[PDB]
Amino acid sequence: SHAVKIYDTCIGCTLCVRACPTDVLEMVPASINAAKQVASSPRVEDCVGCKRCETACPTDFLSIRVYLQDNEETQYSLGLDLVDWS
Amino acid sequence: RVPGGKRTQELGLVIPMADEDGLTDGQVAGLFVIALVVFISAMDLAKTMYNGINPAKFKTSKGKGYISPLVKRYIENGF
Amino acid sequence: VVAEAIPRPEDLLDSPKFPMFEGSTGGYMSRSTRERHAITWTAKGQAKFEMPTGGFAIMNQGENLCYFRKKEQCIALGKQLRKMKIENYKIYRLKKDGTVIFMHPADGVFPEKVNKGRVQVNGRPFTIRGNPQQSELKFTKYQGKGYEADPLTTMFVKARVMAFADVPNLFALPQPNMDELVPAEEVDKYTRQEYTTRMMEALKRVQDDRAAKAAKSL
Amino acid sequence: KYGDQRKFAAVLVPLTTLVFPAVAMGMFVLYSFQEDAFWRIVPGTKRARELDEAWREHPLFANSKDPLDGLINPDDYEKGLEEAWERAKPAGSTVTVKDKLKQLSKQNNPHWESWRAMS
Amino acid sequence: XXXXXXXXXXXXXXXXXXXXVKMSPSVPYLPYPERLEGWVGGEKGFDPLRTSDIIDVYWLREAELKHGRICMLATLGWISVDAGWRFEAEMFQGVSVINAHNKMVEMGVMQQMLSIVGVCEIFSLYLI
Amino acid sequence: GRCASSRYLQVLGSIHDIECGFGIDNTLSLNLQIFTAHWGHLTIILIWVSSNLYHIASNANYSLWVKNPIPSMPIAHNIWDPHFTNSTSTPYSHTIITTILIAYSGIYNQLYTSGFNTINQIYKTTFTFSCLAVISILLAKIHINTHSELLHKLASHTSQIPSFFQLLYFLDVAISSVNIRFNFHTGILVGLFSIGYTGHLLDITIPASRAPLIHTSPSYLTFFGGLKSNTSSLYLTDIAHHHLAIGIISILTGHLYSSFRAALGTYIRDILYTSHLTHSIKSLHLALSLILASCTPLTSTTAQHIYSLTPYFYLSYDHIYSTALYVHHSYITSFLAIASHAHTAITLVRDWVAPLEQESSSKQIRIHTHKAAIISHLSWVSLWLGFHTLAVYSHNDTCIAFNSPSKQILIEASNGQLIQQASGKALYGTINSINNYNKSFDSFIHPISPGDLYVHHAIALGLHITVLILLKGGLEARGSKLMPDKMEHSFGFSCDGPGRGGTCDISAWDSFYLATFWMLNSNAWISFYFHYKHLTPRQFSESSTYLESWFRDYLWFNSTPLIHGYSTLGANDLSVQSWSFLLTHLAWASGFMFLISWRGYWQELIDIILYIHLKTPILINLWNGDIYTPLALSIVQARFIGLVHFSTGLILTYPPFIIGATS
Numbered sequence A: 001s002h003a004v005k006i007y008d009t010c011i012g013c014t015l016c017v018r019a020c021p022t023d024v025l026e027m028v029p030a031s032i033n034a035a036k037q038v039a040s041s042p043r044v045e046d047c048v049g050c051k052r053c054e055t056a057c058p059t060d061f062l063s064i065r066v067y068l069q070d071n072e073e074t075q076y077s078l079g080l081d082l083v084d085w086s
Numbered sequence B: 001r002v003p004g005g006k007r008t009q010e011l012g013l014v015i016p017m018a019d020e021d022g023l024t025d026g027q028v029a030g031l032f033v034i035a036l037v038v039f040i041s042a043m044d045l046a047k048t049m050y051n052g053i054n055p056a057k058f059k060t061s062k063g064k065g066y067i068s069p070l071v072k073r074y075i076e077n078g079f
Numbered sequence C: 001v002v003a004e005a006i007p008r009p010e011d012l013l014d015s016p017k018f019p020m021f022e023g024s025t026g027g028y029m030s031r032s033t034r035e036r037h038a039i040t041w042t043a044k045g046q047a048k049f050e051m052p053t054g055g056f057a058i059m060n061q062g063e064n065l066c067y068f069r070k071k072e073q074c075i076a077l078g079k080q081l082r083k084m085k086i087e088n089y090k091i092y093r094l095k096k097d098g099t100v101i102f103m104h105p106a107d108g109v110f111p112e113k114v115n116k117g118r119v120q121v122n123g124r125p126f127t128i129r130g131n132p133q134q135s136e137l138k139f140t141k142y143q144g145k146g147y148e149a150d151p152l153t154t155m156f157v158k159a160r161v162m163a164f165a166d167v168p169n170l171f172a173l174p175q176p177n178m179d180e181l182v183p184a185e186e187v188d189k190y191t192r193q194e195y196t197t198r199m200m201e202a203l204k205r206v207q208d209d210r211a212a213k214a215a216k217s218l
Numbered sequence D: 001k002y003g004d005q006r007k008f009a010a011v012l013v014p015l016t017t018l019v020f021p022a023v024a025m026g027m028f029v030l031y032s033f034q035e036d037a038f039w040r041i042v043p044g045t046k047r048a049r050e051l052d053e054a055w056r057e058h059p060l061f062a063n064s065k066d067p068l069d070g071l072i073n074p075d076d077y078e079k080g081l082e083e084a085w086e087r088a089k090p091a092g093s094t095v096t097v098k099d100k101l102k103q104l105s106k107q108n109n110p111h112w113e114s115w116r117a118m119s
Numbered sequence E: 001x002x003x004x005x006x007x008x009x010x011x012x013x014x015x016x017x018x019x020x021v022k023m024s025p026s027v028p029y030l031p032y033p034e035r036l037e038g039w040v041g042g043e044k045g046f047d048p049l050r051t052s053d054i055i056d057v058y059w060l061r062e063a064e065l066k067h068g069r070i071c072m073l074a075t076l077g078w079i080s081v082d083a084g085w086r087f088e089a090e091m092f093q094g095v096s097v098i099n100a101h102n103k104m105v106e107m108g109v110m111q112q113m114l115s116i117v118g119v120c121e122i123f124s125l126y127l128i
Numbered sequence F: 001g002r003c004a005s006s007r008y009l010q011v012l013g014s015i016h017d018i019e020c021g022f023g024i025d026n027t028l029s030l031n032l033q034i035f036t037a038h039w040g041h042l043t044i045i046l047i048w049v050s051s052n053l054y055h056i057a058s059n060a061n062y063s064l065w066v067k068n069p070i071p072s073m074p075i076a077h078n079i080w081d082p083h084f085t086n087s088t089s090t091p092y093s094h095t096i097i098t099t100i101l102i103a104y105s106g107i108y109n110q111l112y113t114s115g116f117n118t119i120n121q122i123y124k125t126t127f128t129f130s131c132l133a134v135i136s137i138l139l140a141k142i143h144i145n146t147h148s149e150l151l152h153k154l155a156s157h158t159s160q161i162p163s164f165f166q167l168l169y170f171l172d173v174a175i176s177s178v179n180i181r182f183n184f185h186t187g188i189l190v191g192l193f194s195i196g197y198t199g200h201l202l203d204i205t206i207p208a209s210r211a212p213l214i215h216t217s218p219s220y221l222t223f224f225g226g227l228k229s230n231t232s233s234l235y236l237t238d239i240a241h242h243h244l245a246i247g248i249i250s251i252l253t254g255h256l257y258s259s260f261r262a263a264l265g266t267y268i269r270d271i272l273y274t275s276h277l278t279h280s281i282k283s284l285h286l287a288l289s290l291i292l293a294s295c296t297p298l299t300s301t302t303a304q305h306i307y308s309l310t311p312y313f314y315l316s317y318d319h320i321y322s323t324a325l326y327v328h329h330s331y332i333t334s335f336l337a338i339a340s341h342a343h344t345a346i347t348l349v350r351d352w353v354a355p356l357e358q359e360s361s362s363k364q365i366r367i368h369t370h371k372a373a374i375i376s377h378l379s380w381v382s383l384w385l386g387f388h389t390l391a392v393y394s395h396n397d398t399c400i401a402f403n404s405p406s407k408q409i410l411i412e413a414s415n416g417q418l419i420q421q422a423s424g425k426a427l428y429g430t431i432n433s434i435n436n437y438n439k440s441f442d443s444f445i446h447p448i449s450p451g452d453l454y455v456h457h458a459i460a461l462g463l464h465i466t467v468l469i470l471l472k473g474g475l476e477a478r479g480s481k482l483m484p485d486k487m488e489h490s491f492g493f494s495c496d497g498p499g500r501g502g503t504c505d506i507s508a509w510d511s512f513y514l515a516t517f518w519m520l521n522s523n524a525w526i527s528f529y530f531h532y533k534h535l536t537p538r539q540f541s542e543s544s545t546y547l548e549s550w551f552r553d554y555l556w557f558n559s560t561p562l563i564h565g566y567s568t569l570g571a572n573d574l575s576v577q578s579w580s581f582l583l584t585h586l587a588w589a590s591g592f593m594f595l596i597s598w599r600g601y602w603q604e605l606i607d608i609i610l611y612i613h614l615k616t617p618i619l620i621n622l623w624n625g626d627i628y629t630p631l632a633l634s635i636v637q638a639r640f641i642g643l644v645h646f647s648t649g650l651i652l653t654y655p656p657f658i659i660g661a662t663s
């Protein structure tokens, strides 16, 4: 599994949530921006690592950062279809 | 031998071969004994490196360890 | 939210909920995989769509049900449906035993819509540059994972970086007296609270000795 | 004769370039299916857990992984920090040093080293 | 005073009283090497050059015994061969001990003994 | 859950990255593992030396080559391969006699110069080096046990005070100590090793090279010069005196740092703290980088001076030894040079602590403050050299293709000629003030022509670009404008996604990967320069200012004997050379697909193949793929495998050409 971290610079775009192809991200209420909402990654075990969330993030440097961990890959982080690891 | 390359043919460079044996079979066996010793010791070293240090030996292993008197001096001389 | 009773795909042959789909080799590989993902939705008209595994399909005017090997295919189909103004679609992960796990609209509200009761998971309270240096956390809990450090550890290592640049005012750690300390561990005086007082007095002696030695040629 | 060393070759060359390599490949593929396979680079192996716990049992390396290890008198450090924060506390602020540090140590990263659950 | 000093850190060390140091009985001006205490000869306490300050005494006593044992035999061998005691079998007429080594290695009996000493010493190496 | 097929590549990509080990928890374990690995590697080196000595002793003709070295050829080892013709006779054997290989290493001249005369001495030397390998392994075991015994002595260790935990940092003081290591290395390992080799020369090498002389008197220390006429090599007396001088100097230097006592010598930390350094000397990667950067000038000068001033008997008389040694050592030093930069980048990623933002105290800090200036000026000089070397070469090519050799731009290499003139005046003044003059220096100063100037500019271009790529990777390993968090990730990682413009080849490891191609190209240029000047100095001097000459009169022309090796007319003793030539071409081209074609295509291909396997009647009932799931190689693994193929092909394609052209 990868590591998807959300930083304080988030401005509640919701673009990262919409771009995620495996429903890793979600919007949670907060009080650090005018949108009163920040992103969260409660399900990074389903994060394939496509980094579309990083493409969609418009902050100066990404408020959402995906750290690839190749020696950590699970069946969900690899998108295995022909083969089951469970 | 069938030489190749221009220089070997145009200079007559030849490769002599000893008509004797070189080393007798006894000498080769003598070398192979020590090669086997190296081999056994290297397998043991590979095992030790693979398993690494065991810190929990002080709970089971006998003795009480030892720091050589120079190693203590090297410890307190600095770093 | 109430999880449905999504049966195992090998036991629900010929169900009325299955949309009319062409069927291709892209479907989940049986005989090798037992974990299947199922997505259900209720439509209004039999609008044609595209299966994530190749081939097109026609929904049913009532309930719909599809089985897929990967959650990604279910989410792709969910986005495709949501583009057609079809909400109320749920995505389930089926375990090998048949256990049904409710996954995509986890709390019943889509993740792009703020819902109360959620907490920022994997949140870091600083700019991305605020992460501690990897070199600082060597052989600690975060040996090669400086982005996983708790903010207190980041502040602590930042303060350490600030401190370990004023070299002249640092305190050199005294060299241990190996030869005359180091008795058997059973040979201890206990008195833990007194041991910190001994620390204080010994360090005071060390500092006084260092000051006296420095005030000879400086 | 210049030959007569080929008696050694006719055994050694087939041996070390066919029998030993084949045995090595078979032993390697067998080793690949051990629970200990590549325990130093592959996460979540049993031997890695045992080695980490063995290191933690050593009296020197008990509090070695703690990034904050080193404070000789942490009570003195905490008292000094609390005193320094009291003189700089903004107006009627209700945050203390103790709970501030407690909540700054507790982060929410469930998916960190979750591979410590199989072996 | 067996300890080299009495302190807590080696910057404020308090060296032991000069008349109170243990001191070696062999070399009276040197402190006693405490690493030798327990071993057989550790009453003359003789280790200048400090070769036991660096090397486990188990090694040195192993080397000391091997040297002494091998010399006790070699001294007897040289004395007997010099006084004239050549083994009963023929081919052992080396006339003189000084040329016995080169004579016998030519005959072929030294290569046998070197093998027999070699295997026992390899067994010794495993034991050590 | 379990792993996929990429586990093997992932594990083997960091199989020796002891810092990445999972059980390793402290610098004690890391340092002890590294020390034991050093012992094992020394054992491997000793076994390799004993191997060469054995094969020279047994399957070779040292006893006959020593008698008539100039026209004779040495034997590497016998050939025992059941694939050859069981009938007739191979081109590598004298009819019914066994099959042999000609040695191109140079060990024969080494042993002859060192004083070897008989096979028995070589056999005894082989035995002694095998003994030394045993000794090295036993030392590894000894040190593992001594450190484990210190660890166990921590079961009887307490300071009776909370400062007892300080002993954690001193457990590996045996390995991590620097002052003692520097003192004893520079003194013993350098100076006294040189002095012992001077003793070896005076006792054996000089006695076993001339008629019997006095009892190794001090007249054995001469100051002649170079190239003794008869053997076309340096005087052994000169070599002994050189080693004696170096030994004395390094022995004196070795008493610099505070090694064994606190009352003698200055500390390295205090030396650095009062200079333009004060780097983090506790980093193992930093030490490795700066000693690899030390073995690089040593190996490059070894390559240069084995050829320019041949030190071994009859080494210049071998047309293949001289080129093979130079090319080998040039490649070794290029690898070490790029290694130094790679480990500097790894040091910056892993083992460097930096101030907050502005404290310009560390040397790395000051370098990083203006890193953009460094990279911009390196790019400028690289662009200038490339433009003005390629353009002048193109001018010469075009004007010589147009039947106008006199229209070329030939800048006379005036600066190199001035340096050569000054050195030659110094050497001639040395020689003229001798009663035993008429000495020779072989190729210490060589004819320098406009072709030499252009090739030197090309070599400078290659070095500049290699340093540019490596230095940019090192300086931006901790963060660039494109990816301002690069020190949070590994030293090598795939990419940063297709967004933000696209981020392929963004890691510092990717900078190393790009720079290895330029290292190979620069080394190829250097080796081509040396080999072309070696084959025909006259033709190189005249026709080497236009690249078509390099293409035709060197590559196309000198490849004639190699391709003719095995054909439909018979075979030569170059058959292995031609076969390896083609095999290395295949290896070089095979790595193109690992570099050009990238992962996703192949991952889809592997999914299709896996579909087949899970669809085939018998396979599906034995193997569902859930155990060792076949997956396409990851991105970094793919780049590394393509780099390995490319490097192997480019490097190993050259020795067949060298052997075919020179022999």
Ligand code: CLA
Pocket: F586, F589, F590, F591, F592, F593, F596, F597
């Ligand atoms: C010379 C270099 C080279 C070689 C050998 C290959 C080889 C291959 N490519 Mg490839 N490729 C290359 C360069 C090369 N490529 C380059 C530069 C590109 C540009 C991007 C591509 C792009 C590319 C694509 C896009 C595709 C291929 C495909 C293929 C495969 C189809 C051919 C096949 O199966 O034959 C078999 C392979 C051989 C090398 C033939 C020789 C086999 C040897 C001689 C016999 C066995 C040796 C013997 C067992 C020795 C044992 C080993 C020893 C250790 C004991 C094959 C593995 C296709 C594929 O995989 O589809 C099936 C495919 O889709 N390639």
Ligand code: CLA
Pocket: E026, E036, E039, E040, E041, E042, E043, E044, E045, E046, E047, E050, E051, E052, E053, E057, E060, E061, E062, E063, E064, E067
């Ligand atoms: C190879 C021979 C050898 C070896 C390995 C030892 C080993 C040992 N002896 Mg021992 N001893 C020896 C010969 C040897 N002895 C002889 C011949 C005598 C008679 C004088 C003694 C008398 C003696 C006494 C009285 C005592 C010891 C003790 C010891 C122990 C501690 C001393 C130590 O660390 O030295 C070990 C290391 C070495 C001996 C290496 C020395 C090698 C040097 C470099 C050679 C220098 C001499 C050289 C040949 C002369 C130069 C010739 C010319 C220039 C003048 C140790 C087990 C002490 C003991 O019992 O402690 C438990 C003790 O009290 N020894």
Ligand code: CLA
Pocket: E070, E071, E072, E073, E074, E075, E076, E077, E078, E080, E081, E085, E086, E087, E088, E091, E092, E093, E094, E097, E100, E101, E104, E109, E110, E112, E113, E116, E117, E120
């Ligand atoms: C340090 C010990 C030592 C050594 C190296 C020698 C060496 C030698 N002796 Mg000698 N000798 C010794 C002690 C020694 N001696 C003692 C103590 C005595 C008195 C009993 C003699 C009495 C003696 C006689 C009377 C003669 C020799 C002769 C010789 C020479 C030829 C021997 C031969 O061919 O092998 C014969 C032996 C073998 C082929 C193998 C014997 C088996 C070995 C020695 C025992 C096993 C090896 C190992 C040590 C295992 C024991 C372990 C133990 C520690 C528990 C040779 C130079 C001969 C000579 O010089 O004249 C021609 C001769 O005639 N020796």
Ligand code: CLA
Pocket: F376, F377, F379, F380, F383
């Ligand atoms: C106004 C035009 C202009 C100016 C003043 C400079 C000035 C500079 N460039 Mg540069 N550059 C330019 C355009 C320009 N560049 C363009 C268009 C490119 C894209 C190819 C580059 C690519 C480039 C690189 C890659 C590098 C520089 C570098 C440099 C610096 C060293 C000098 C050098 O290498 O020149 C050589 C310049 C080139 C090789 C680029 C080609 C020159 C172009 C074609 C000139 C275009 C001028 C323009 C058409 C004028 C139109 C006027 C009209 C509208 C009125 C210097 C500050 C180097 C540096 O940073 O070192 C300090 C360096 O490494 N430049």
Ligand code: CLA
Pocket: F381, F384, F385, F411, F412, F413, F414, F415, F416, F417, F448, F452, F453, F456, F457, F460
């Ligand atoms: C980036 C620029 C650059 C670089 C890296 C090199 C590098 C090298 N040159 Mg070189 N050279 C250059 C530019 C450069 N040159 C120019 C512009 C000329 C004039 C045509 C020469 C003429 C030249 C000769 C004649 C010789 C070398 C040689 C060498 C080699 C030995 C080092 C040496 O003595 O150089 C000298 C150092 C320099 C030239 C540095 C100057 C850098 C400046 C900035 C370049 C621009 C200067 C400018 C055009 C002057 C204009 C004057 C005008 C106002 C009147 C080395 C590979 C020697 C060689 O390889 O012999 C085997 C040799 O004999 N060079």
Ligand SMILES: CC1=C(/C=C/C(C)=C/C=C/C(C)=C/C=C/C=C(C)/C=C/C=C(C)/C=C/C2=C(C)CCCC2(C)C)C(C)(C)CCC1
Pocket: B029, B032, B033, B035, B036, B038, B039, B042, B043, B045, B046, F039, F040, F041, F043, F044, F047
């Ligand atoms: C009994 C006997 C015999 C037999 C013998 C034999 C059987 C032998 C064999 C031998 C052999 C068969 C040998 C082999 C060897 C090998 C080697 C010697 C190798 C080595 C290697 C090394 C040393 C390295 C290692 C390593 C690695 C690579 C991994 C990692 C780690 C290390 C580094 C360790 C006879 C009768 C004859 C005689 C008598 C006695």
Ligand code: SF4
Pocket: A006, A009, A010, A011, A012, A013, A014, A015, A016, A017, A038, A039, A053, A056, A057, A058, A059, A062, A063, A064
């Ligand atoms: S795209 Fe970036 S800024 Fe926008 S909500 Fe997601 S994380 Fe926050």
Ligand code: SF4
Pocket: A004, A019, A020, A021, A022, A023, A024, A025, A046, A047, A048, A049, A050, A051, A052, A053, A054, A066
């Ligand atoms: S990397 Fe892809 S799957 Fe992972 S959180 Fe970002 S968008 Fe979602």
